[PDB]
Amino acid sequence: QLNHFSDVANKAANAAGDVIRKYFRKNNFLSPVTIADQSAEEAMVSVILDNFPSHAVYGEEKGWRCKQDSADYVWVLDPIDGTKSFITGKPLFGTLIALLQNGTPILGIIDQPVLKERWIGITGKRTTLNGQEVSTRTCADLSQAYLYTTSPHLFSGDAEEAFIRVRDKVKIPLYGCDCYAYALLSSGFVDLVVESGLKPYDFLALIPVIEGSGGVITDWKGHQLRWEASPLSIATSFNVVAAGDKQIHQQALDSLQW
Amino acid sequence: QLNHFSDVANKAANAAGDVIRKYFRKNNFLSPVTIADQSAEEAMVSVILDNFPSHAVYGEEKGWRCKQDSADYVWVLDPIDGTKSFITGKPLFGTLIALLQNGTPILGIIDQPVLKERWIGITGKRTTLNGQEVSTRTCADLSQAYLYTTSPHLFSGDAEEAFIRVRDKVKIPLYGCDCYAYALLSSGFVDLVVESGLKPYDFLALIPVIEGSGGVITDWKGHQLRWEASPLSIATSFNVVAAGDKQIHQQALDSLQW
Ligand SMILES: [Cl-]
Ligand SMILES: [Cl-]
């Protein structure tokens, strides 16, 4: 069963990547990004549900869908995380696939279909990039950490104050690539990622990837980042902090003061 | 002679790309980026000067070099524009090659060796990406423009105020990829790029690329962005504004108030 979930997840990613590649970089003059997202989601759902008709699927547009009233297994998908990147021709958006068992992610994929880079996290296994194991790196102190976040403008209210406290303490704050930064963290090239306002379809896949690489990912209070997808779950936004090194993670929590 | 300059420039880029690819993503535990930069520069200079022994070369580390007291032709190079991207494993740095005749760029290359994307601007020709012509796009008003800049933190003093006036007027401000944003602008996926603090080795190659795509690139006063490389030229930093559409460019100048 487990390796069957992985095989189907990879089939889904393969289909999404072909769809996305058809539409990427077509807009130099419904928009291609909306067609691409919808068509990619459909391609993924189709192969998932053909294999697993008792499973549910969750997506931004259609919300929860399941042929039954409830499901033990829920696939939570974002064909294009990083729409602004996609729209502007920057190949650092990603396709995110998560499978949840009883509300907990057991598999996550971050796929960059232009670069042909696929990170796969599976509970029980070390995370891989294109089939090869990866690991986070150690970091001596927050002052030595390379930090990413998507944009300085995606922090509102009290969250902006909190971000700034961490931002001012790191080696350097870098910007602009959505899920891709978490992939880099999982491969040991980035020490910290701090974001505010992520929907569950844009973080659940990250969890197995990062944890299975040796990293840490929580909400800004240090609690488990969780979203139990269900017929009534609300796709609200969460604050995320991921680190390659647990000591860095704690220093970040202490600066956020959330 | 002209097509000979292009052929040699491409040879230089091919060599740099192999060197860079050897070192990219090696640092997950002299640094690889410094070895890569030095070795790539050496590879480029070697083939340039083997072909053109009367030419000069200019680089960050070694400054002006020429076997003669003066030169009509000067190659101005940056093997790795976007060192922070390189160091953190993000494949959006670029290799920049410019050839100047009497101080004016006649050829520019933006090469992304991981993505295998090469933009070439040559005076007299339309700009190409991987051999295919590209063009900028029209934009109706600054309020519709997609803007890129590397980082919010790379504006100091009065330049930060000026950037903010433009930033607040565009459709959306996006961040994080150095020369790559100018390549996207040249291909018609980005409308505006506004940066402060660019060395001449990080802007001269951009000029033929953007102009030959139909765009506009100047300093923040709208004057020609120029740097006459010479035995005594000083590699200071410049403010740059590039637009796909001349009307947008002028609206940006009016907001910068430089
Ligand atoms: Cl089933
Ligand atoms: Cl010569």
Automatic annotation (TrEMBL), chains A, B:
The modification N6-methyllysine is found at K90. Belongs to the inositol monophosphatase superfamily. GO terms for biological process: L-histidine biosynthetic process. Its cofactor is Mg(2+). Mg(2+) 1 binds at E60, D78, I80, D81, D202. This is histidinol-phosphatase. Mg(2+) binds at D78, D81, D202. Its EC number is 3.1.3.15.
